[PDB]
Each structure stands twice: as C-alpha cells, then as structure tokens.
Amino acid sequence: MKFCIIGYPVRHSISPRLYNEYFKRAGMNHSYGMEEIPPESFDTEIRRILEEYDGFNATIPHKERVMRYVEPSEDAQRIKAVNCVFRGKGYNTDWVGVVKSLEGVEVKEPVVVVGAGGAARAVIYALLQMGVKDIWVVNRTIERAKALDFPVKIFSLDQLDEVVKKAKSLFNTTSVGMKGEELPVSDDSLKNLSLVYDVIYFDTPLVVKARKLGVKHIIKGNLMFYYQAMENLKIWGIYDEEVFKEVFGEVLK
C-alpha cells in the first residue's frame, strides 16, 4: 500500500522517515511519501492523490479542505477536520493523540486554547471528551472563530495575556513557535499554570519559558504525534505494537 502526507508546507515533515523505517523494520512493503500542495492547486491535485494512494495524512492547511473529497467519520464531522484518510473514508486521529498524550494527567480548568483551526478543534473535542467544561479559545482570524460550534468562550489574541492569568491550563494549537515566534503572554500569567501544552513537535519559546517558570506539566507535540501515528496505523490495518514502540518511540526521547 501507498501512503503520504499532504499539506503546505510539508517538505520538512518528520512522517516519511518514521513510517518508512517502521514499514522496513516490520517487513512490510508499504511506502510513505509527501505532497506539498498549495491551496490554489488543491481541488485539481487532490483527485490525483485519491487515485495514487491507498491512504494519507493531511496537515495544515488541508484538514478541513479534504473533507469534501472523502466520507468523514462522525467525530471528524464534529471536529470539521480530517487528518487521516483510508480508501475514501476520512478520520480524525489528532484528538485521539491529545487524549492519549494526557494519560495519567488531570487537566485543570479553566483551559485556554490558542487558535481555532483544525488542530484547535481536535484539542477542544479531546478536552470535552475528557470532561473539561471551562474552555476559552483565543484566536486570530474571524473566519475560524465563526467555524467554532463548540461550547467555548472566544477571545482575540490581544486578550491572551489577561485570559491566561485566570486559567490553569494552556494549549498552543497554532504554528506560532515553529520559527521561534513568541505568543503575547507574560511570565506572570504563565507562572501559575499547571499545564503548558504545545502541539508543535519541537521546543518553542512557550515551552522553554514554561520550563524556566517551573510549570508542573510541560508537554510538547511529540506525544500527540506518537499516538496519532499509532491510531493511523490501526485504521490502515498495519499496526505492529512492538515495531511501533521501537521505531516511533524515538520521538519520545
């Protein structure tokens, strides 16, 4: 079977190397590639993808976009985002990644979620599944705020500093931090949080700051990535637990 990751950007994705190493170690003939498709070319180029690959992952900015071209699951519909496709069917494994990444951890409220994209909606869904009630979304764009149907409060990014001060958990779901950017939030607001969670795979200024301040739990995007990958492989019917732990376990250290 053939798989890939689609998105924009996606050329620096960590997925191809990991899935390909996994397939090789498991003695499987499967392959994992990459397709960096600009938004303006998506409608034409997705048809090629659907014909050439058995399944694929979707990342920014295509998780919501790809829904029109597949049959989404009930949870993917609620989230309005598909990040895992298999033979015409769309799924969301991001929220599963979030739930499993927080195993053994009590998520204290109120919870601030930065962003309102597909990643944010997956995080919100996960939090609601975990019985979290008080969720405050802080985002940048009007369009994405209007796509939110969840029982949340919505604030603009200039309010981030004030709202985090009144919260106990913070989730960054945006790409802010990928190129070393900082969110508009003070040490004073961050210091008494019990959880700082960043969907970004590597150290961000937010994560580094949280460590400096001694925040109890500081979780980067590596656990979320690990567990969404696990769910992807289960959906694709190609999950080998021991090989997965050996190969994908490298993202955890």
Curated annotation (Swiss-Prot):
Shikimate binds at residues 13-15, 59, 83, 94, 201. HAMAP family: Shikimate_DH_AroE. The keyword Manganese does not apply. GO terms for molecular function: NADP binding; shikimate 3-dehydrogenase (NADP+) activity. Keywords: Amino-acid biosynthesis, Aromatic amino acid biosynthesis, NADP, Oxidoreductase. Coiled coil: none annotated. InterPro entries: Aminoacid_DH-like_N_sf, NAD(P)-bd_dom_sf, Shikimate_DH-bd_N, Shikimate_DH_fam, Shikm_DH/Glu-tRNA_Rdtase. One of its GO terms (cellular component) is cytosol. It catalyses: shikimate + NADP(+) = 3-dehydroshikimate + NADPH + H(+). Involved in the biosynthesis of the chorismate, which leads to the biosynthesis of aromatic amino acids. Catalyzes the reversible NADPH linked reduction of 3-dehydroshikimate (DHSA) to yield shikimate (SA). Its EC number is 1.1.1.25. The keyword NADP applies. The gene is aroE. Belongs to the shikimate dehydrogenase family. Pfam families: Shikimate_DH (PF01488), Shikimate_dh_N (PF08501). Transmembrane segments: none annotated. NADP(+) binds at residues 74, 115-119, 139-144, 199, 221. This is Shikimate dehydrogenase (NADP(+)).
